[PDB]
């Protein structure tokens, strides 16, 4: 009993929106009996979250394509009163007809991935193009997002829970809101880009960017990370949890250290003139 899984590499999203345009292309003007009515303009079955970090000039930005998690322990199946069901292959689907007249369904979602269709008076959302996955004719054998990507962000697969579990540990795959225990089958690679923060700076020596300066990050006094500054005299420690840290710098025997507070924000220490 093989199940479907999807892996999204945040580090590779450029927000071109090929996914999103892919659903729309597949669902806005088409109706799929047994799966879903036509999509409503403005809905985001595929919601590409955008998050800028830091401040000019050492800022950055990352994106998190967010479809349906089709979680193994689905809350809306449990509280959907039969209007939502789970297939053997892991896909979680809304019954297009049983769901009509029930706006309450949207609230059974911790991820808020379902949208209310006015014309159809029903909740709608990600179906993982089950209609396409259930049809041999669809040669690609994968959803429209993944197929429309030109950035190699998506990894669609159908394997055993064991094989997926093995992949998760090798690649350090993560899920959104693990603490809720819904167990999403949509995993994220390099999720720290979107969920965590960093501290950066530019080291100068005698007015010029210094390369090879040794930088160390500490929390509680113990080294958390380290690196040497590049030719722009910069360093960047990402994947940091909120808290206080100390940055220590050694260049040409000249040392410098300062504290940094990470509070759901990334910090640019600016130019450090040594």
């Amino acid at each position: 009993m093989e199940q479907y899984y999807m892996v999204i590499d945040v580090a590779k999203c450029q927000d071109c929106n090929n996914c999103f345009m892919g659903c729309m292309d597949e669902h806005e003007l088409n109706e799929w009996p047994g799966y879903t009515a036509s999509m409503q303009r403005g809905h985001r079955w595929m919601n590409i979250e955008r998050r800028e970090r830091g401040t000019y000039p050492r800022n950055d930005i990352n994106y998190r394509p967010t479809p349906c998690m089709h979680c193994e322990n689905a809350p809306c199946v449990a509280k959907g009163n039969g209007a939502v069901y789970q297939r053997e292959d892991g896909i979680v689907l809304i019954d297009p007809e049983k769901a009509k007249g029930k706006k309450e369904l949207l609230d059974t979602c911790p991820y808020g991935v379902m949208y209310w269709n006015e014309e159809e008076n029903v909740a709608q959302k990600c179906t993982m193009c089950a209609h396409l996955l259930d049809d041999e004719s669809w040669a690609p054998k994968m959803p429209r997002c993944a197929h429309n990507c030109g950035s190699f962000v998506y990894e669609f697969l159908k394997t055993t829970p064991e094989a997926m579990a093995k992949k998760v540990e090798e690649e350090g795959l993560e899920v959104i809101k693990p603490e809720l225990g819904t167990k999403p089958r949509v995993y994220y690679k390099n999720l720290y880009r979107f969920e965590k923060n960093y501290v950066t700076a530019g080291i100068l020596v005698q007015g010029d960017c210094f390369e090879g300066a040794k930088v160390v990050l500490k929390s509680g006094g113990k080294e958390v990370a380290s690196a040497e500054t590049n030719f722009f005299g910069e360093f960047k420690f990402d994947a940091l949890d909120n808290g206080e840290y100390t940055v220590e710098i050694d260049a040409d025997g000249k040392s410098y250290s300062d504290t940094v507070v990470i509070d759901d924000k990334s910090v640019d220490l600016g130019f450090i003139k040594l």
Binding site: D15, D25, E52, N59, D208
Partner: protein
């Protein structure tokens, strides 16, 4: 009634497989190759790895949602006539755009049949030709078009128009401005309008690249052109190889946002200050290829003294450059030192040339600054060149297949590149003939696209060059006038499309020109009811390429961009199948023209008895395709993957020049007569001229032009923050690059799916507003918050926009894409604030220089504030 069928077609966003059922398009997707019938891909062994492309094509966003454009409710329904227009009575020119002025465009028109619509246009055509002559009939499409070689403007449009009128509003080299009116004088490449060749650069880069400087380059967003996201994996390869990526762009563009190792954000119009400071550093530290320069440069000694500040008294230091651009001196110097000691490729622009930086008030010096830098580092030798990572793919340059620029069925040897090779293959001087124009030529009459408003409203104009002056370096210097000697002023305007309000400069003037009483008749042959269309007297519905038969190659423009199919991972030639019947009462441009040809009594000559599919087969036979398959086999398969050519010898771009030997690439130039024993550049000396001999001649002949000196120097940008008096009122520097989610106007608006993209348009109280990115510091200072409706304005007009607060811009700089398809005046057309998002209402219409008659859009000074809701009817 039937099953789903997979068909093929293409677009400006890449080829696509089209699934059709019961006469309706179900979906459009990228193409999967079938290794059982599609030839194997190329391979590049480099630095211990084997690089080969994905067995698939890719598409752009606007192509992914293209279906919503085909079935758009803003699609022109049927022939339309302006109610207030009476051919035999009151023409009321002053009422053109009246509906638009009362925010009710459609109400201005009434439905009419194709028969009556064409009869009306024909009556106008014949009246005007017998009273004033064909030159009194003005006409112009625009830079881009629905994909398809046979139906492309260089083909169908020209073939018909050349047999009818006419006075062409020749297009300014928009894409190349800086390189065209500037770089060309420094290194030639006129046949590429200033851009460099790029042959075999991918392998050279994979083997030798250590660093790439993306200057005014966003390969992801632009893809060079027409290439979806074909190059994304190539930079991934480079990245994984350890190659550093530095981006210099006022805006932290999309490529930078993805793989930047460092980002520079120079104030608008200040890039050449950086190039000058980098050169100064190399001269002060002897960190450049002297041997190279000593052999391949002209006037470098004098230029060196300028860079060193001996002759003007101002050494071009990184500090001096920081004060000009806002970019840290130390960072400028560190980049200079790294550039000098590492194998660095200069990615000027997204194509290998181009770059929004080239069409701005400092466009000429930026272009020359890029050539200067790449020259000093010995471009052409292994590990050093101008390469933007989008071209240089090892495709079979020996296989011949026409790009749309080669003219298709027109065979116009002067207004298309048919003369190079296609014309000779397509026509036989026996059974099929070309359609030449004795008017759209230098000795005839044409007018500048950028100055159509002045020609119409002013009745007169004088300028330099005719359109794309790629013939030779000095062709752009030729002087012209309107009306041309012996020719007549414009009486009629036959528009093809209507994007100028969002794509030209200080565009309110394009709206104003339509009501001038000198304009007796305006016809609009377009697809969507948008932009300029609501100003016409008669509107004719054309259809997209998905509703007609055509043929084309993935991203193949050719002509002024010879072999640009090298932008893709594979050469994909596909049949553009008529997937569905034309929508509503529209028809293909060719059929429209065929109908006119019939009523103009020139049907036989125009069509030669062929329909679109007939012309496609003849087109097919004039290429190398027959070597691999017959028309029938091709028509059936739908697409063809050109086989790899493993054994051909590699000829890296400019290496022949670097090595002082004969030109050996497949480039279309320099012409033999522009070289001594076919060595050297097209320039007189055959070298890179820091002091351009051609311009020195021009200025010595009496054409004094302070903003285009013969010697590449630091000419302060006439529309920058510290050099223009305007900065007092409008302190913010605005750049307006090409739209991320649309191929210019083809994607935006039209009630398409692209309008729902978060970073394209923001819905506010029911209306989806265009976006303007503002640095948090400037937003904060104006009480502006993310999502607020703001008013961007200057002496040229006002535009209402949705604010996007960001860190991706140096404080003092604002960003808002151009090419908005929606013109939606809040008051009188051309006299009030637009909320459609036509940012080009605010760009400078002043020519780059007195004689460099190109657009300088990307350096515009504006002021913004929270919109108080007024309509600002003050223009």
């Amino acid at each position: 009634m039937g099953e789903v069928v997979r068909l093929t077609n293409s677009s400006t966003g890449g080829p696509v497989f089209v699934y059709v059922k019961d006469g309706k398009i179900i979906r459009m997707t990228p193409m999967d190759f079938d290794d059982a019938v599609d030839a194997p891909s190329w391979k590049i062994e480099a630095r211990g790895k084997t690089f080969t492309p994905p067995r698939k094509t890719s598409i752009a966003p606007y192509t992914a949602g293209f279906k919503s454009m085909i079935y758009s409710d803003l699609r022109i329904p049927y022939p339309m006539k302006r109610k207030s227009f009476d051919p035999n009575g009151e023409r009321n020119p002053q009422l053109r755009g009246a509906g638009l002025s009362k925010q009710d465009p459609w109400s201005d028109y009434e439905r009419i049949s194709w028969d009556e619509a064409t009869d009306i246009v024909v009556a106008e055509i014949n009246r005007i030709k017998h009273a004033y002559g064909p030159s009194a009939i003005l006409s112009t499409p625009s830079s881009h078009h629905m994909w398809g070689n046979v139906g492309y403007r260089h083909s169908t449009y020209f073939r018909f128009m050349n047999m009818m009128g006419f006075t062409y509003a020749d297009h300014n080299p928009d894409s190349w401005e800086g390189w065209h009116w500037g770089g060309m004088h420094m290194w030639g490449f006129s046949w590429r309008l200033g851009n460099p060749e790029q042959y075999d650069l991918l392998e050279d880069g994979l083997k030798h690249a250590e660093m790439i400087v993306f200057w005014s380059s966003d390969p992801e967003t632009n893809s060079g052109i027409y290439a979806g996201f074909e190059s994304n994996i190539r930079r991934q390869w480079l990245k994984d190889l350890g190659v550093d990526f530095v981006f210099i762009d006022p805006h932290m563009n999309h490529t930078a946002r993805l793989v930047a190792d460092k980002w520079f954000s120079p104030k608008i119009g200040t890039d050449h200050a950086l190039s000058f400071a980098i050169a100064y550093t190399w001269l002060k530290e002897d960190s450049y290829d002297k041997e190279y320069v000593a052999a391949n440069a002209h006037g470098f000694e004098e230029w060196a003294d300028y860079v060193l500040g001996k002759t003007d008294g101002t050494p071009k230091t990184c500090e001096w450059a920081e004060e000009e651009s806002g970019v840290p001196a130390c960072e400028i110097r560190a980049l200079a030192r790294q550039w000098a000691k590492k194998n660095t490729y200069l990615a000027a622009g997204g194509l290998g040339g181009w770059g929004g930086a080239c069409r701005a008030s400092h466009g000429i010096e930026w272009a020359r600054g890029m050539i200067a830098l790449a020259t000093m580092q010995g471009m052409g030798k292994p590990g050093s060149n101008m390469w933007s990572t989008t071209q240089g793919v090892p495709l079979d340059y020996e296989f011949y297949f026409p790009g749309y620029a080669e003219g298709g069925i027109s065979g116009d040897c002067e207004n298309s590149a048919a003369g190079f090779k296609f014309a000779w293959r397509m026509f036989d001087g026996k059974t099929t003939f070309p359609s030449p124009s004795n008017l759209n030529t230098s000795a005839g009459q044409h007018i500048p696209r950028l100055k159509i408003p002045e020609c119409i409203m002013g009745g007169k104009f004088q300028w330099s060059g005719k359109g794309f002056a790629g013939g030779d370096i000095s062709h752009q210097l030729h002087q012209y006038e309107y009306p041309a000697p012996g020719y007549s002023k414009i009486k009629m305007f036959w528009k093809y499309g209507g994007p100028h309000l969002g794509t030209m400069t200080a565009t309110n003037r394009y709206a104003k020109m339509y009501t001038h009483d000198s304009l007796e008749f305006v016809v609009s042959q377009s697809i969507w009811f948008e932009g300029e269309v609501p100003f016409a007297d008669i509107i004719l519905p054309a259809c997209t390429n998905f509703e007609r038969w055509d043929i084309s190659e993935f991203a193949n423009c050719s002509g002024y961009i010879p072999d640009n199919y090298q932008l893709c991972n594979h050469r994909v030639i596909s049949l553009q199948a008529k997937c569905i019947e034309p929508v509503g009462e529209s028809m293909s441009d060719y059929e429209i023209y065929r109908l006119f040809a019939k009523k103009l009594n020139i049907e036989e000559m125009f069509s030669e008895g062929k329909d679109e599919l007939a012309w496609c087969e003849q087109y097919f036979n004039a290429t190398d395709m027959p070597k691999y398959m017959t028309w029938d086999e091709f028509f059936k398969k739908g697409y063809f993957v050109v086989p790899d050519n493993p054994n051909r010898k590699k000829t890296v771009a400019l290496r022949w020049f670097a090595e002082g030997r004969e030109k050996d690439t497949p480039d279309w130039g320099p012409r033999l007569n522009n070289q001594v024993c076919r060595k050297g550049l097209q320039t007189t000396t055959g070298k890179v001229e820091f002091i351009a001999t051609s311009l020195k001649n021009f200025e010595e002949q009496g054409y004094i032009d302070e903003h285009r000196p013969s010697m590449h120097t630091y000419v302060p940008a006439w529309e920058s923050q510290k050099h223009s008096p305007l900065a007092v009122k409008y302190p913010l520097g605005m750049l307006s690059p090409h739209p991320r989610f649309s191929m210019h106007t083809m994607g935006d608006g039209k009630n398409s799916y692209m309008n729902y993209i978060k970073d394209h348009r923001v819905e506010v109280d029911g209306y989806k507003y265009w976006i303007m990115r503002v640095n948090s510091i400037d937003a904060e200072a104006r009480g502006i918050k993310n999502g607020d409706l703001i008013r961007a304005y200057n002496d040229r007009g006002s535009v209402i926009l949705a604010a996007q607060v960001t860190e991706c811009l140096q404080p003092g700089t604002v960003h808002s894409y151009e090419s908005c398809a929606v013109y939606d005046p809040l008051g009188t057309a051309g006299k009030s604030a637009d909320r459609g998002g036509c940012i080009n209402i605010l760009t400078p219409d002043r020519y780059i220089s007195k004689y460099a008659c190109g657009m300088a859009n990307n350096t515009a000074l504006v002021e913004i504030e929270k919109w108080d809701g007024d309509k600002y009817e003050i223009y």
